Every structure is written in C-alpha cells, then in structure tokens.
From a paper:
[name]-[name] proteins play important roles in metabolism, cell fate determination, growth and development, and responses to biotic and abiotic stress. In Arabidopsis roots, [name] is specifically expressed in non-hair cells (N-cells) and activates GLABRA2 (GL2), a central regulatory gene for epidermal cell fate determination. Previous in vitro and in vivo studies showed that [name] specifically recognizes the cis-element [name] Binding Site (WBS) located within the GL2 promoter and inhibits root hair formation in N-cells.
Helices H1–H3 and H4–H6 belong to the R2 and R3 repeats, respectively. The [name]–DNA complex structure showed that the third helices (H3 and H6) of R2 and R3 are inserted into the major groove of the DNA, producing a sequence-specific interaction with the 5′-AACCGC-3′ motif. The third base pair of the 5′-AACCGC-3′ motif, C12:G11*, is recognized by K109 of R3. The NZ atom of K109 forms H-bond interactions with both the O6 and the N7 atoms of G11*; the average distance is around 2.9 Å. G14:C9* and C15:G8* (the fifth and sixth base pairs of the 5′-AACCGC-3′ motif) are both recognized by K55 of R2. Owing to the presence of R52, R58, and R60, the outer surface of [name]-[name] is highly positive, and the side chains of these positively charged residues form extensive H-bond interactions with DNA phosphate backbones.
Author numbering: 14 to 119
Amino acid sequence: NEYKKGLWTVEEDKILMDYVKAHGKGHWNRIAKKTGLKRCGKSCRLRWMNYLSPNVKRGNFTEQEEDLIIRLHKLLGNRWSLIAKRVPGRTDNQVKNYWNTHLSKK
DNA sequence: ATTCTCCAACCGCATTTTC
DNA sequence: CGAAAATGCGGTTGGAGAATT
Ligand SMILES: [Mg+2]
C-alpha cells in the first residue's frame, strides 16, 4: 500500500496535467512509473476526468441542468454515465452527487 | 469548542485489454 | 489460449470547510 489515497494536492495535479499534455490520455497505470506520482492509474484517470479535463464545467448546476437531470433520471434510473452523456460538461460523478445531495432530498 | 454538510475520491465488482 | 492488468461503473463515506453551540 505504497500508493497515496485521498485529496489531490496542487503538486500532484501539476504532474498529472503535464503528463497528459505531453503524452495524451490513457495508459493511466504508466504515470506513477514514469513520474514521481504515488497514484494508481485508477486514481489518475478519475482526477483527470472529473477535475483537470478542460471539458468539465466549473459552475454550480443551473436550474435548466437540474430539470434535465430529473427527467433523464426518470427516463433512465441510476445510470449516471448514460445520464451524463446528455448533460454537456458534467460527468457521471457530478450528476450522481447532485442527485444524491440536492434532488434525492426531495 | 463541537456538530453538520456535502462531495471528491475510494471500494468492490464486472467488463475489456494485454500479451 | 487465459491469467493478469487495466478500464469503467455505481454505491458509499472520510474529512475539509461551514455552520452551530
Ligand atoms: Mg456530460
């Protein structure tokens, strides 16, 4: 269990970002071996897709996004990657979290 | 001081890929 | 060929930061 777990530091982010910029996405397992990063591919993949990627939206969910997600969820159930495909700039994990914290309350 | 909220990132598991 | 490694998914929760006593 040499791999670090938990919150990514800015130092770790920079190493992951520089690697992905230089060598592209994927082969996530190679990163720890090629860099000083103590992170498994699984953890790298997730950090890239949910935070570092230039395609992810940063703002709070809009009322229009909320309505879209409610309706997609009604159509599709708890199939978050399938739902996220029709929510521009939001990932499965974002949509799931929004549902569980904000919409599952109702 | 302590309790609460919320979400980033983990876990276990199934599917896909590698060699 | 097929065992191990890598990818991807959805449920779950540790703990930072916000709120309360
Ligand atoms: Mg999306």
